[PDB]
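Problem statement: downstream parser choked on a complex file, so we are re-checking the raw output for the APC run. The parser issue turned out to be on our end (a line-ending mismatch), but while we're here, posting the original submission so the record is complete.
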Amino acid sequence: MKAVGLVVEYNPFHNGHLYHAQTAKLQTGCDTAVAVMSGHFLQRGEPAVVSKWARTKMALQSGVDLVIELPYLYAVQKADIFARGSVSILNELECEALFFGSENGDIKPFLETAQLIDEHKHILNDRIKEELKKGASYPAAAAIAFSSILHTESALDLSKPNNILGYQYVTSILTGGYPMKPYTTARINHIASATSIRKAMIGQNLEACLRFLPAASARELAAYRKSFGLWHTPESYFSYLKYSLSTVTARELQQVYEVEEGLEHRIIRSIRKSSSYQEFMELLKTKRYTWTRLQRMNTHILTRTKKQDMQKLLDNDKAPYIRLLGMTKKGQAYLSEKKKALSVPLVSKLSSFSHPALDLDVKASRIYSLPIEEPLRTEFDLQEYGHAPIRYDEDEQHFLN
Amino acid sequence: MKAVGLVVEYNPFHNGHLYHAQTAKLQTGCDTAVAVMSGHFLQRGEPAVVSKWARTKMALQSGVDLVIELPYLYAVQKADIFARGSVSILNELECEALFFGSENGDIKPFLETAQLIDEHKHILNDRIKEELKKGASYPAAAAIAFSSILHTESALDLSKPNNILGYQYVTSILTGGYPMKPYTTARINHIASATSIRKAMIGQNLEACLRFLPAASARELAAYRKSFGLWHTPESYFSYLKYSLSTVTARELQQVYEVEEGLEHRIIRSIRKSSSYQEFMELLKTKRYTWTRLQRMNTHILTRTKKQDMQKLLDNDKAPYIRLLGMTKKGQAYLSEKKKALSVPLVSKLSSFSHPALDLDVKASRIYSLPIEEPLRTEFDLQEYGHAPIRYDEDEQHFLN
Ligand SMILES: Nc1ncnc2c1ncn2[C@@H]1O[C@H](COP(=O)(O)CP(=O)(O)OP(=O)(O)O)[C@@H](O)[C@H]1O
Ligand SMILES: Nc1ncnc2c1ncn2[C@@H]1O[C@H](COP(=O)(O)CP(=O)(O)OP(=O)(O)O)[C@@H](O)[C@H]1O
């Protein structure tokens, strides 16, 4: 009984995510698909359109057996830390495999580059040395060193995003010592992208994106809209970001994770006169800061996550806990088989453990719900503590809760 | 040139305030009405209905010749402190007279009581401790020691808020030795309480109040809700209370001004389960908290005002500055005559001076606009700076700005 791991934000689950989970099981030979998912704030620093409890329910009927929350600790980070934490969660769960998409069905060039960078790391790092001495920036210096070994056309494209993630996955399995075998396929009812489907619902029009969405997704979505009265956008939080930066001191703001030295001054100038998140993002953007990095900082500013607390938790070599969002009868089975073997606690109901990284997960949720119009927001809030793992039965349609 | 000082929060300015400003210059013989007025958040603890700017306008048109902000420092405080700073500012501007409405039109039991109490002030703390050592609570031991005198047929219930403030201005005066003579009268087109008016405005009723409000005051409110789309309610800020209590730990919330030790827990717990500001309160009530003290505490939570901020600022026996909100023709001439006399900065353009207490008023002003939707909110936030001090022409109605 062998498990194939998937690193996923499911934003939301669509037929393309369906191609992933079925190919995965098929290609890897695993009967069980375990997905580790970013819950309410994702890798690029934006909120999930819908609660992780909803998106858990979608995937459980779409062919995923276990849904484990990737803690906020590793979820809002660039790819290498993101991959480091997610892969540690899959390693902890004894997945024989890791299945990641890029535009290539070929797993080889990811491997070829890895060792190449792995082995030349010294040569690479020493080459970054000389270059900063010639007066280059570090990113330049890095771009220069890579190019000596890398510019052979393999060709691994470090541009196309989901490739980058794949490389870091391969990276993490390599330096972690994990008995994990990386797989992959070329990313593709012709299927549409996660983003463009978000634009749909956002425009209140959910009807454009259907044939691209699995059935059960559409329901729980429309259910989430009917239940809590909104779909979530970054702009939903702008008033709360605006409060956050109002109640902070520049000294305090300097200590927020991803606010680099000196920027807290630029930050504050911008928010007072910004009428939108868009405008605010605009005034903010620098060379030192890519869009998505800013959305990560703003998120940490939103959750008021400090640097030291963050360095504290990133220090841990493995995932602090395994957070159980949902399971099939198979996922429950696989689990109860490997549960004894887990070296960190399995969290189903929130009362079952206490860790600083989990407070983070729960605080993220407490912020997330704010755009819900009261009292509906309050009802929602009972879930994080209330909701026990979501259990689906693949003999069709039995939820036990 | 003679001014009478007026300690006020016009929320809104009503028929009771119109009559009190005329009688002021009447009974005090002073050619000038100088009001010190809570800016945005008030003594009762709640948000002002309308910005300090527009409320200044209901006053300048009703015979108040000068309006100074009562800093948050003084404004959102227990009456003992609120009285001190307000009276303190009015003497800085050298008001020779003081005028306050009251449930007792009679200053003599105000003057008596105060002059009575210090005469015995040793006798009290003895009977207090005698009650205290016998195990009485603080207010009880106070209620008892204080009823060992004063309990004659006089009445002048200091169970009444007006008599409270009134005694407190008078006390601050005498204790301060200020050369300012205090006056008072009872409270009576027609006339009701600002509160009864507010609650009527909350009840989707404005022109109902028009017997109870002067014209300018009435004309001024409509333009507000027109431009920013709201009247400001305590409940209106609830989401930002939920959000601000969502990011804070216990030991951080402990350090907020007016949050007693250990009460952080109950607050943090209660905010989660409250879908209503009202619900929130009832979960928070302990006999060591009046209802206003709770409200006041909730403001400090919203503005993130810390014990050390407050207490380190509360220390001084003078006022940090004079913020000029607005002035009439008469007012300006009075400011000019005494301008050289102010021992503390006269702040007109905020640019001119920077102070931690001033920093605090600016903070409250950014907190104030939060319920306002954009584009307006960003535009509201402009007013604390690039707003020239308002000026109005006493004789036939002209603002010069
Ligand atoms: N059409 C498709 N074909 C193959 N794999 C897919 C796919 N759609 C999604 N996946 C895979 O599913 C895994 C998790 O996907 P997510 O990260 O949730 C969505 P995404 O594809 O990154 O959205 P995006 O297209 O807006 O970037 C990734 O390994 C991704 O490659
Ligand atoms: N109708 C009236 N008669 C006498 N005094 C009045 C009055 N209305 C207000 N005042 C006095 O004017 C001063 C300023 O009052 P504010 O603090 O601005 C509102 P308030 O008076 O507390 O509301 P209220 O008028 O509903 O009591 C107070 O000292 C109050 O006693």
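For whoever reads this later: DSSP finds 18 helices and nine strands in chain A.
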